[PDB]
Assembly symmetry: C3
Homo-oligomer: 291 residues x 3
């Protein structure tokens, strides 16, 4: 069954097929194979990009959509996630998109249900459709992953994005760098080399920024000086390679991880990422429901 | 007009016709007679099965759907329910599905409004689509209601399900039994015979469990020892008749009214009920909008 | 791309064109020009009827619909409104309908974004589609605005819709009267003559009632004696001219601004206004997306 839980479960060939399908859908390719099928979006945590790009994708595929907010009344408390899924199966749901607070809620659940589950974030674990759309954006820019340097910046240890991305990029032939407060690094990582932002900006083909959370940083790391100290300043961006790009999964904390003036600057692909996410999610749903 | 408020307002022939229509829909029958019509789902109290079951039903009928989720301060400006419905009529709504907190909210309403109202639960009063889907499940199993013994267990006094069900089952020719804490029984119910669970499991063709609320009373009756004391234990289930079934309107409080292992055991029809609910609700909507 | 922010930004010719388009759509004129396009309803603040009316309009135009409300979106993060809209643009939204608490949220936003924004209500209280549907209702009745006497009743000082209506009615050639507690009157107002309700009912072609808020009432006027003292009583309504009409934006506080028996009386157009709202909103959306 074609669940999508983690990037680790996709081969580099599967990944490349998904990017190619997404690119074709972006170019206007459409079919009616999924018309009238039902998708349920179960979001137990807040989301703007992922939730609504999934909805657009479902509707562009001609699907009927059920939306469940799990932190609300439309999901019984204590009443198991397994039962919720089985309930949805019973009423005719063909695929479920889930964002849940628990790391790896998927493992056990996925083996016991009978419709494909698409992980919309089990942070701080995995965010596979976010990795796919980042890869798609990088692939559109350079037409290969081999020999690229991609640097990822911020709280690496707690990032589902940074985690989905570093290992898969290296599997695809890229060199990965990390930067940020040393205390937010996992200095047991095999997939990236820790450097300073000032070094990373000059050697990277892709400068990937993470959101510096206001609501979670239980640290000795001030947001007020973050940009100057660690973030992508205008001066640092000016030292980027000619053909390099800036990426950020959003929402962007303007003036913290990045200078406000750079979010929509020439080298930025931040909003292009969001465009691509819809087509990636269409491809992933098609993979889930194909026979 | 073809409202659906209470099982009492349906003749036994109307009930059998609805079940048959639903069975035909379940089998794959379909038409486009309601395509593009508008349904409004007004759930002023929480719901998972009923609400999403109706939404699937509506969408399978080709209808556009307006959802009003929660007593959220959408229409909370003191507007009468009558004005809310007349408002929906004015904007083009063809049918309203309503779950409300007030018992018999529908009585005054149904003679006053101009579009059909489908009751999705009115306090602890009635829940007619639940009864209908229950009946459909029972009929599929036995191909008759005559001479069946159906036992219903839990807080009979405060149950909209037990109320819809007990009376209609006797009208259809079945015998009804009740079990549960004596404090939760109708002092004077004329439709059922109070017995112990241990007796009921051996004499029933249908064992119907209700949800035991940890909401409200774990004080009137403790939940920790409920299963052993009153509930469908594995030992009790092993004493059920060979052809008997276990039913439950859900959500299930696993380990309280029923042993966790029984929810999807061989005699359980709990998830089949949920399958059937969609087709019952399609049939009810078609009856509402017929001609 | 045509935004809708305030009535004062529309020319009288633009207003007349919108009313004319809406009248044509009300008559059944339809086309497929917007089928499949995406509308996003961002109701950061609650509303019963405006959101539902927009959603019916969108769906009657064949559009796909995304519903947001700030709660379960990454909006509740630090994400700016601009970023939210740009995000929606990127995932393929063609038009946004926004009800938002910030004073003139639109003014900054509309110079910045690349898709049309339709103001469904801002911090200041500007509500152009309400004004448009009121005008449409009036125009259907009399086929002109020129020389009409329109009276508006209640807390004029704190109703920005009353004040925008007065201003636009005056631009359209009508004469505007106000009545209500003298302390709720706007002395500065140059678009209205203050009179008693007892006078206004006899000289008005249109009697426009405002909801009297049990709410607010910092300095309270009593609600219990309000109808007799200031409101549209049966005896007052019976002195209206034969062709005159009663209007109210809803929800109606029955027994306060108006006698309960008058809401659906012969001269009342209250529910007709709500019918008209759908077609006005279809027309405004077609204006927004016309090529």
């Amino acid at each position: 069954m074609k669940h999508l839980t983690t990037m680790s479960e996709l081969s580099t060939e599967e990944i490349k097929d998904l990017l190619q399908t997404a690119q074709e859908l972006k170019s206007g390719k459409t079919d009616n194979q999924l018309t009238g099928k039902f998708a349920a979006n179960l979001f137990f945590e807040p989301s703007t990009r992922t939730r609504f790009s999934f909805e657009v994708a479902e509707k562009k595929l001609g699907m009927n959509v059920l939306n469940l907010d799990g932190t609300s009344t439309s999901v019984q408390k204590g009443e198991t996630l397994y039962d919720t899924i089985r309930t949805l199966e019973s009423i005719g749901v063909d695929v479920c998109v889930i964002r849940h607070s628990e790391d790896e809620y998927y493992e056990e659940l996925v083996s016991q249900v009978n419709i494909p589950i698409l992980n919309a974030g089990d942070g701080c674990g995995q965010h596979p459709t976010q990795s796919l759309l980042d890869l798609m954006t990088i692939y559109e820019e350079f037409n290969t992953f081999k020999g690229l340097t991609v640097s990822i910046h911020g709280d690496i240890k707690h990032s589902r994005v940074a985690r989905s991305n570093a290992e898969v990029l290296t599997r695809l032939g890229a060199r990965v760098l990390f930067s940020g407060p040393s205390e937010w690094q996992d200095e047991e990582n095999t997939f990236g080399t820790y450097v300073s932002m000032d070094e990373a900006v000059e050697s990277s083909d892709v400068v990937m920024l993470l959101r510096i959370q206001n609501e979670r940083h239980q640290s000795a790391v001030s947001q007020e000086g973050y940009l100057n100290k660690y973030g992508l300043t205008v001066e640092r961006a000016e030292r980027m390679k000619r053909h390099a790009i800036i990426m950020h999964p959003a929402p962007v904390n303007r003036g913290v991880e990045i200078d406000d003036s750079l979010v929509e600057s020439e080298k930025s692909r931040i909003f292009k990422q969001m465009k691509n996410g819809v087509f990636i999610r269409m491809a992933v749903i098609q993979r889930a429901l194909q026979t």
